[PDB]
Write a structure and sequence with these properties.
This protein is α+β, with helices and mostly antiparallel strands and 265 residues long. The protein has a single domain, classed as 3-Layer(aba) Sandwich (Beta-lactamase), CATH 3.40.710. Helix content is 36%, strand content 16%. The strands form three sheets. The protein has a five-stranded antiparallel sheet with strand order 2-1-9-8-7, with helices on both faces. The protein has a two-stranded antiparallel ribbon with strand order 3-6. Helix 2 packs antiparallel against helix 7, helix 3 crosses helix 4 and helix 3 crosses helix 7. Monomer. Pfam families: Beta-lactamase2 (PF13354). One of its GO terms (biological process) is response to antibiotic.
Length: 265
Amino acid sequence: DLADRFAELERRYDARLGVYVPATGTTAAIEYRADERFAFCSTFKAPLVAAVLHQNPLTHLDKLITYTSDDIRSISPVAQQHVQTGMTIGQLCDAAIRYSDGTAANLLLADLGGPGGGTAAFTGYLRSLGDTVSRLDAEEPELNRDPPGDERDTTTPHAIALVLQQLVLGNALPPDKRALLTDWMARNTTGAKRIRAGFPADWKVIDKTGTGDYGRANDIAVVWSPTGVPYVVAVMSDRAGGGYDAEPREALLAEAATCVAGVLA
């Protein structure tokens, strides 16, 4: 049944909708286009932060990184203010998660080192989580621009939801590191109109958004019921039929999230 509203929302918003909520003890998995590939856009910045956390001792967070304005290639509300001073890895994490800072993303990518300016290491990290589907191939901002059907820089709701589950609810990171990822996601400033808007306020929501061309709008979230039961909620969308300049529709993700909440209540 619930698939009918998801298709109803797809037709209402002229969009392709991807939802995955992992099965829990109490609840069955929610799937809609869950194994179709959607572009990460900025949603990769969350598993990216955990990658840097994973390979690196907590002291690594204090290492200062310096860069030029040639490095600033994308929406970078934080990086553009520290070009003279540079930023520590830790601030790059904060910026990359809480403000979706694209330049911080690219620097953290560089921090993983290796081919494709870090994308291969990053995908390599996803593999260590059991995700054999997702792949990152480009940096910011090209990774937002791959044409529909192109498999590069794509994930699936299924794949990214389970990744996120391991990182926030599972043991992918030791607790001390896990608390920084969670807290940055909890203080995210970019998600207010997506998953967060579709859930009642007494549900706690941590999320990482993604936006791109072809009407790409994503939000991956961990939510807590009023009684504290956690769920992972992966919502992804694009509007390929509208062309590279198709406008993303945030309300689509909010409406979809409200559908999810109704099933979980």
